[PDB]
Amino acid sequence: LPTPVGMEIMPPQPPLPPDSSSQDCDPTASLRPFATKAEADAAVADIRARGRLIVGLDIGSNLFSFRDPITGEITGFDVDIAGEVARDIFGVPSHVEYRILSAAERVTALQKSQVDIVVKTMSITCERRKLVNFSTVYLDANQRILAPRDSPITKVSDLSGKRVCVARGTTSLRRIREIAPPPVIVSVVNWADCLVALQQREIDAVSTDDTILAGLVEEDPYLHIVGPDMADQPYGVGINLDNTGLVRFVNGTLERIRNDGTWNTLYRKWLTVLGPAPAPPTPRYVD
Ligand SMILES: NC(=O)C[C@H](N)C(=O)O
């Protein structure tokens, strides 16, 4: 039996209070794109000279960034979003190199300038905005619960005292830490590890973005998604705090794909399990 390396039963801790200052900073507002093509091209000249866009992501999130078992290629919604940025830089999307990063390493790789962008289901938060920059929102998810079809778990309070899996370094862990009385919290490196743990009955439920959970359901249709929206998860492209030019550039790409049909095509390609495509998230700008 496969045992995913890195599984930890976390020490019992008192519930954290829900923090109401979380929206103080208006986290989803970002920087307006450049008005001229020449300004935008200048802002990515260093990337262009390096010959490829270096993108941080992983292979642990089915539907978002994973290795296709048939073609062997890294693919998914997040891969395709990153490829549209590369298309804007290079003219075609294929000039991308990946740096494999866990959820807990997304901020550090940006701080250390180890990638140009992170496209890895990265929720935009005020705490993260103290450390990195973000594009406007490219997909809006919400934290829910995944359990086997025969499980009685249907609401948040059912998680108390039960074994709930979360990946380390995620907003999902922070939300589960609010539950009173606490679940038994089992943490792992990536969300695919939570699926293995549930398949082996080493946990009782998984809680994270409904988008990610839908990817797990696609791999294991014995599971289903239950419960209310537990916490908004607005995804942004993560960028080094000081590279404001790249923020504006990526926001230009997002304006393009929201309006030229590409975003709709990518949603239909990857996410129809969640329902018919909504309108793309409306961008918000500070300036
Ligand atoms: N694994 C994830 O990305 C979960 C959540 N979107 C986060 O930003 O932490």
Numbering used by the authors: 42 to 328
Q: What wording appears in the published article?
A:
The conserved aspartate-specific solute-binding protein (SBP) GlnH links extracellular amino acid concentration to PknG activity via the periplasmic transmembrane protein GlnX, thereby controlling glutamate metabolism in Mycobacterium spp. GlnH belongs to the solute-binding protein family, specifically the polar amino acid binding family, which bind to arginine, cysteine, histidine, glutamine, glutamate, and aspartate. The fold of GlnH is related to bacterial solute-binding proteins from ATP transporters and to the sensor domains of glutamate receptors: two lobes close around the Asp ligand in a Venus flytrap-like arrangement. We propose that the amino acid concentration in the periplasm is sensed by GlnH and that protein-protein interaction allows transmission of this information across the membrane via GlnX to activate PknG.
To determine the structural basis of discrimination between higher- and lower-affinity ligands, GlnH was crystallized in the presence of Glu and Asn. Overall, the structures with different ligands bound were similar. The greatest difference is in loops 99 to 103 and 109 to 113 (DIGSN and DPITG, respectively), which are displaced 2 Å in the Glu- or Asn-bound structures compared to the Asp-bound structure. Asn is unable to form a hydrogen bond with Trp 232, providing an explanation for the difference in affinity of binding.
